[PDB]
Amino acid sequence: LFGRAFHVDPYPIYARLRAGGGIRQVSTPDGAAAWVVTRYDDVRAGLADPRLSVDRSNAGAGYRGFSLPPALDANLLNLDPPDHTRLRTLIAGEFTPRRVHELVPAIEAAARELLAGLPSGEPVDLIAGFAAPLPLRVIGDLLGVPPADRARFRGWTTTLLTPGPDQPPTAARDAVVAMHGFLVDLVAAKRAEPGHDLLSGLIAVRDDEDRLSEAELVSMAFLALWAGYENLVHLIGNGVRALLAAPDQLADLRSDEALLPRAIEELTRFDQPLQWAIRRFPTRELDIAGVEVPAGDTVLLGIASANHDETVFDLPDTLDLRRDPNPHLSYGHGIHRSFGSRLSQAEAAAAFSALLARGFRAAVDLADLQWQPSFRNRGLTELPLLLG
């Protein structure tokens, strides 16, 4: 079900769930239950449905904390309107497409520099050597991390969000405490000595005396770390593996540089890491996929399953970099849709462009690759490569 087969490849299980009607109540060995929703139409409608809340105040007695919001305290992903509308409007005033555009030259140079620090003709781990350092560098720039704090930031972000498979189970918990204090301290530093980063701009943001609070700023930083590092690291890793697993697609991409933007969207649809949206709670009894779901029940909308729905995408379990249209739901839909669609697309393009220019091949048999044991975030433990 949601064990070894699911961790190695979840899409055959998603196919069974869609074939079974697209909604099922699943239970842990301890009796915690949630509804998994797996068909594109229901996942898309669910994501935006105003009757599906992210606020735990609307959860019922059976709530056990599936697919939690990626931050402590009030944040965009645990609030409904009107409180959500305020935060979104405030943050959108500085998290702008122009900000992302102006970061692209630095992102592209960082990708070239990181890959250039990796030797050729020698097994190298793409994750620790490239796919993790690049987003970590970008999110550090975005949050204005000073150079003296980059080492501690890297260590705690990695322990928090990309743990080793044999990391002590308490280390990531401790990293929550460590990073909360780091982020509180970082906000204080920017409050005193402002720069041109997002955190500084967010502190300056004002709506007729309305401002963002310390807790709101720190919570937003946690959200940025989750999606700007954990999601992006494995978007790159899973994308490279998918390219290596489909040589003909790789050869087409290598022959047509203009294919890259559409190729990244297919790579995202094919194996982006996020399997479920943030848990949702019907504020009323709601018909989902033909089942009347009780108010307050936990509902998991299967983004990854939807991206492989055969009723939308032809041959959905095959990589087709020229797939068109490609209405993948990887960045959400509705009021909570991702702030980072473009940023992710820019970091992915920089990462794949540098890899394509350097040359790369698997250093191991792909069947010997190991996947991290997660329910929500699909990613590789390591990906040994040979660089040109």
Ligand code: HEM
């Ligand atoms: C580039 C870095 C990224 C940043 C800074 C970022 C930022 C955010 C933020 C702030 C939200 C909350 C928006 C809200 O609730 O109003 C969000 C939601 C979301 N992001 Fe991202 N994101 C990034 C990358 C990604 C990636 C790589 C994916 C996966 C393909 C992704 C998928 C999502 C989804 C699905 C949601 C909505 C969750 C839900 O509605 O349950 N994002 N993102």
